[PDB]
Each structure stands twice: as structure tokens, then as C-alpha cells.
Amino acid sequence: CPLMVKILDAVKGTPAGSVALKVSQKTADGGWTQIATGVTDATGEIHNLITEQQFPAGVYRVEFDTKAYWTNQGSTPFHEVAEVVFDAHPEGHRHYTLALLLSPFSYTTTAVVS
Amino acid sequence: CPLMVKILDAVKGTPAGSVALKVSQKTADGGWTQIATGVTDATGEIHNLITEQQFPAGVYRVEFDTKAYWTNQGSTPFHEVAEVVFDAHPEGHRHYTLALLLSPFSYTTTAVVS
Amino acid sequence: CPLMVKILDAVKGTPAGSVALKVSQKTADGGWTQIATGVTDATGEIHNLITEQQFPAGVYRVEFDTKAYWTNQGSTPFHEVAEVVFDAHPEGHRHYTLALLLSPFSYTTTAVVSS
Amino acid sequence: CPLMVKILDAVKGTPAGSVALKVSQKTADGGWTQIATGVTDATGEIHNLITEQQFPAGVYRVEFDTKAYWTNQGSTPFHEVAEVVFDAHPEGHRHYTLALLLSPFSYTTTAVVSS
Numbered sequence: 001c002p003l004m005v006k007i008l009d010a011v012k013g014t015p016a017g018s019v020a021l022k023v024s025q026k027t028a029d030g031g032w033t034q035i036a037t038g039v040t041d042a043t044g045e046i047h048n049l050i051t052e053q054q055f056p057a058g059v060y061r062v063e064f065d066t067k068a069y070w071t072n073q074g075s076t077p078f079h080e081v082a083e084v085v086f087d088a089h090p091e092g093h094r095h096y097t098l099a100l101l102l103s104p105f106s107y108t109t110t111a112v113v114s
Numbered sequence: 115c116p117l118m119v120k121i122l123d124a125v126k127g128t129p130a131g132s133v134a135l136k137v138s139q140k141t142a143d144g145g146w147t148q149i150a151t152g153v154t155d156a157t158g159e160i161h162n163l164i165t166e167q168q169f170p171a172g173v174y175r176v177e178f179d180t181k182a183y184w185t186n187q188g189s190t191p192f193h194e195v196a197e198v199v200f201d202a203h204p205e206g207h208r209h210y211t212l213a214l215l216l217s218p219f220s221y222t223t224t225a226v227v228s
Numbered sequence: 229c230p231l232m233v234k235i236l237d238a239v240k241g242t243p244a245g246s247v248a249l250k251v252s253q254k255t256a257d258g259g260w261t262q263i264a265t266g267v268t269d270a271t272g273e274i275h276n277l278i279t280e281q282q283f284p285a286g287v288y289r290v291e292f293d294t295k296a297y298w299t300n301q302g303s304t305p306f307h308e309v310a311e312v313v314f315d316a317h318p319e320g321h322r323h324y325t326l327a328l329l330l331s332p333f334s335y336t337t338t339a340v341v342s343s
Numbered sequence: 344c345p346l347m348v349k350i351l352d353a354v355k356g357t358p359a360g361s362v363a364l365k366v367s368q369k370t371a372d373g374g375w376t377q378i379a380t381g382v383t384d385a386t387g388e389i390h391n392l393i394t395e396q397q398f399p400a401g402v403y404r405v406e407f408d409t410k411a412y413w414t415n416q417g418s419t420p421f422h423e424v425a426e427v428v429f430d431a432h433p434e435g436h437r438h439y440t441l442a443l444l445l446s447p448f449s450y451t452t453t454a455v456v457s458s
């Protein structure tokens with residue numbers, strides 16, 4: 001699996017479970033095609049989110065529904081959504097992990113690329 | 115000024131100068147329309163980005179062109195853009211500061227709401 | 229002032245008010261001497277934390293009492309304290325802003341250094 | 344394995360390998376006893392840093408040598424060290440992961456605590 005996520009909750013010190021997300025692929029005319037959806041497990045991960053065949057070189061957008069997460073936690077969040085947008089070059093079996101650390105009024109995101 | 119930004123560079127320990135951004139407003143039909151552009155000064159700020167009259171209650175998107183910033187620093191960035199999306203004045207009019215801390219493969223966003 | 233702090237609360241989206249801190253200087257023998265204490269105002273800052281006379285080149289430690297901040301906010305925090313340790317004026321005199329973004333189980337710190 | 348670390352490099356998008364760190368345990372007299380030292384592997388982790396037997400309830404300090412990490416990357420860093428200080432098993436045994444995201448002038452640190 002070439003695309004992994006890891007979401008953490010900075011208030012509770014746990015992974016962020018049951019966060020919905022959407023993966024979209026940029027098209028030649030600059031629009032977006034949705035190619036996958038998923039919900040994190042209790043470890044803040046989505047196993048087998050997409051296949052290598054579904055992940056050619058191109059720009060991708062991962063939309064995390066953080067507002068619903070915080071609302072369900074009982075906190076009022078600032079952000080309507082958290083989007084991560086990046087150009088992927090998966091040649092050579094290159095894999096991407098998107099890490100996201102959530103607080104109600106902040107988030108940190110980073111990427112680990114191997 | 116009801117909407118302020120503050121962008122810092124975590125590689126250099128300075129504000130991030132000359133970062134381009136675009137402000138869009140969510141439309142009634144669920145789309146977006148661009149209402150302002152700007153470029154940070156050497157303190158990482160944009161004075162008079164929009165007026166209070168341009169900033170009524172509703173959802174806004176600020177698109178920060180972090181890829182161009184890092185390219186112009188001679189670094190290779192991960193993200194195509196950094197987007198911050200939020201509902202403004204949902205319980206009354208306030209002032210918003212969007213803070214953004216940039217590294218080539220990571221960013222931290224937070225908001226200070228008056 | 230040559231050493232400024234800015235503390236923000238990532239749960240509430242406000243500055244972190246009434247955070248206590250201590251500034252110390254590393255001694256020739258490897259110990260620490262306290263040179264200042266302070267408590268942030270409602271903007272998350274401490275005006276006139278130290279003077280230039282108190283800030284010769286060397287290693288300094290700023291200890292932020294984040295555990296008491298969260299305990300008073302009514303949250304249960306992870307860290308006992310948050311410490312920022314840096315060599316000041318290594319290549320000549322500079323001014324320093326230490327920014328700190330607090331959550332109960334996380335913090336981010338960065339520095340803005342200018343000539 | 345009750346204490347794990349995970350260090351990432353925010354400039355390169357890789358784990359931070361070969362980071363030296365020290366683990367100290369606070370003593371009743373308010374001092375610190377060093378109980379372990381380690382170096383991260385190429386995944387930014389240290390396997391078998393300490394045993395459950397070495398990790399009773401109490402306050403611990405993990406000192407990460409971030410300055411040497413950046414100095415060897417050829418970068419110029421701000422912080423002299425990054426220290427993480429926390430009270431362990433305050434309400435019963437848990438497992439602790441200390442995560443650290445490094446940039447030359449910033450770091451973010453969070454904890455994941457199991458049950």
C-alpha cells in the first residue's frame with residue numbers, strides 16, 4: 001500500500017479513531033476525481049487505503065473530516081476540514097505516510113516518504 | 115483588519131517573507147469565489163488583507179502558496195499548497211489571526227480568535 | 229527587550245495567560261543560575277522579561293510551567309514542564325522570540341532570531 | 344517495551360536516524376539519575392530502550408541531542424537540546440511513545456499513552 005495516514009489527538013494523547021477521509025486525484029484540467037474513502041481505526045490508521053495500481057504519479061488531495069471528529073469529542077473546532085495536497089512520484093515503490101496531529105484550534109501535518 | 119496572517123520559517127528562524135496567498139469565500143451553492151490576494155512582507159504579515167466589509171460571516175479558505183515559497187528558497191517542498199478553511203463570525207464578529215509555521219515537509223497551522 | 233516569549237493555547241485559540249516561567253543561565257561549571265521569573269499576561273507575553281545587562285552570550289534555559297497552566301484550565305496534561313534551551317549570541321548579539329503552542333499532550337516551539 | 348520514541352525530520356521527510364538520547368529518572372531529593380542512553384536507528388526509533396522493570400512510576404526526563412543531529416546534517420540549529428519531562432504511570436502502568444518532529448529552528452513533541 002503506497003499511501004498511509006497516521007492521525008493523533010493532542011488533547012488526549014491517543015490516536016484519532018474514526019476520522020473520515022477522502023482521497024482525490026487531480027485531473028488534467030485542474031479538477032478533482034475522488035478515488036477512495038476510508039475511516040481511521042483505533043490506531044489512527046487506514047490499512048490498504050488504495051492500491052499501487054490506483055496511485056500513479058500525479059497530484060493528490062486527502063480531505064480529513066476533522067470537524068466531525070472534534071464535534072463528536074465534545075470540543076468546538078476551528079477548522080472546517082483539514083486538507084493535505086501533494087505531488088506524488090511513486091516510481092521505485094515509493095511510499096507516502098501523511099501524519100496529522102490534531103488540536104481543536106491547530107493541526108500539524110508532516111510527511112514521511114520512502 | 116479583521117483577518118491577519120503570521121507566517122514563520124522553521125528552517126531559518128525568521129518570518130516567511132514573500133509568501134503568496136489567496137482568500138476565497140464559500141458561496142451559497144457550496145462552491146468558492148476568490149475575494150483577495152496578498153503577499154507577506156518581511157515580517158511574515160499582510161497588512162490590510164481585507165476590510166471588515168469584505169469579511170461577513172461565512173466560511174473562508176486561505177490558500178498559502180508554500181510550494182513557491184520553498185522553491186524560491188532553493189528547497190524541495192512536499193506540499194503543493196497549504197489551505198486553511200474556517201467558519202468566520204459564527205457566534206458574532208471577531209478578529210482572526212492565522213498562524214503558519216513552515217518546513218519543507220511539514221506545516222503547523224493555528225488560529226488566534228479575539 | 230532582547231528575549232520575548234509568545235505562548236498560545238491550541239485548545240481555545242487564544243493566547244495562554246498566566247503561564248509562569250523561569251529563565252536560567254548555564255554557568256562555567258555546567259550548572260544553572262536563575263536570572264528571572266515571570267508570568268505571561270493575557271496576550272501570552274512577558275514584557276521586559278530580562279534586560280540586555282542580564283543577557284551575555286551563553287546557553288540559556290526557559291522553563292515554562294505548562295502543567296500548572298493545564299491543571300488550572302481543567303485539563304489533564306502530559307508534560308511536567310516545557311523547557312527551551314538555546315545558545316544565545318553564538319555569532320554576535322541577537323534578539324530572540326520564543327513561541328510556544330500548547331496542547332494538553334503536545335507542544336510546538338520555534339524561535340524567531342533577528343539581528 | 345514501555346518507552347518508545349519516534350523522531351522525524353521535517354526538512355527531508357524521513358525519520359531522524361542516529362539521534363543520541365539519554366533517559367533520566369527523578370530522585371526523591373529532586374535530582375536526576377541517568378538510567379539509559381540510546382541512539383535512534385534509521386527508522387527514528389530505539390528498540391528495547393528500557394525494561395518494564397527499569398520503568399516504575401515517577402518523573403522521567405528524555406534528553407534528545409537535536410543539535411548534533413542538525414550539525415551533522417550540515418544545518419545550523421537553534422536548540423541546544425530537546426527535553427521531554429513527564430510523570431509516568433501516575434494512575435497505573437501504561438506504555439508511552441514520545442514523538443518528536445524536528446526542524447532546525449522548531450520542534451513539535453507529542454505523546455501517545457496506551458492502557
Ligand SMILES: O=C(O)C(F)(F)C(F)(F)C(F)(F)C(F)(F)C(F)(F)C(F)(F)C(F)(F)F
Pocket residue numbers: 006007008099100101108109110349351440442443444451452453
Ligand atoms: O510514531 C509514529 O510513527 C507516528 F505516529 F507516525 C508519529 F511520528 F508519531 C506521528 F504521529 F506521525 C508524528 F510524527 F508524531 C506526528 F505526525 F504526530 C507529528 F509528526 F506531527 C508530530 F509533530 F506530532 F510528531
Ligand SMILES: O=C(O)C(F)(F)C(F)(F)C(F)(F)C(F)(F)C(F)(F)C(F)(F)C(F)(F)F
Pocket residue numbers: 120121122213214215222223224234235236325327328329336337338
Ligand atoms: O503572535 C505572533 O505573532 C507569533 F509570534 F508570530 C506567533 F503567532 F505566536 C507564532 F510564533 F507565529 C506562532 F503562532 F506561535 C506560530 F505560528 F509560530 C505557531 F503557532 F506555529 C507556534 F506553534 F510555533 F507557536
